[PDB]
């Protein structure tokens, strides 16, 4: 009801992922990359 903020997704990155690649870095991308 108050909102579940535990789940996050990446919005910003300098490139696209390769198959089964994982990127969990939090360095601010030209913005904080996760929302």
């Amino acid at each position: 009801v108050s909102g579940n903020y535990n789940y996050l997704y990446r919005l910003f990155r300098k490139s696209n992922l390769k198959p089964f690649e994982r990127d969990i870095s939090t360095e601010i991308y030209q913005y904080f990359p996760l929302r």
Partner: antibody
Amino acid sequence: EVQLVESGGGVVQPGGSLRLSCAASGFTFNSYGMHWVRQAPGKGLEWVAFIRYDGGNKYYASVKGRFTISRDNSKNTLYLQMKSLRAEDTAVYYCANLKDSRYSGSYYDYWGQGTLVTVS
Amino acid sequence: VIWMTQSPSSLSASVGDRVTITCQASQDIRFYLNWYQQKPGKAPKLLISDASNMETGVPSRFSGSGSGTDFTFTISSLQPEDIATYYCQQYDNLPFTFGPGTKV
């Protein structure tokens, strides 16, 4: 000792061309990727191009479409072919092996002395 | 293309003073930054790799740290031999880029 020796500099006219070379010795040239970096009087360091150890993949900066990078691992020589040179390309051209944990993997950083190219 | 900047562009300090140079990236480059020192008439010399690792032979008075977009280069005590232009360079992705350069 490790050496990188640039040559082939000089003065050319606008729209002309010039081929530079860098002779390498003292290290396993054929296992490393190589970079070209230039510096004009009054300015900072500008990255120009990179070639992989096998002479396969090539990358370019402001110069893409005009400059070509190549190497010959049997002569330990790195080349840069510059076509359609402009006044803005006046600079001292260095060959280098830049320490890089992501792409070339080089653990050591080497530089040449640089050769001056003037366009006018 | 990742754009690099440095601040201040030029600084005035005496021998024995503490000197700090800030390098900032337009994009997050984690810890893949090199620091170079260039004296007039000479090729650039590498002092620091991977943001904070010192090169062999580099005096202990030199140091640096940082991650992401904000990096710092420090001289704990400026020596008369430390007058040079300092550059930061990113190698997170191609093309590689150098900063404007800071005059000490």
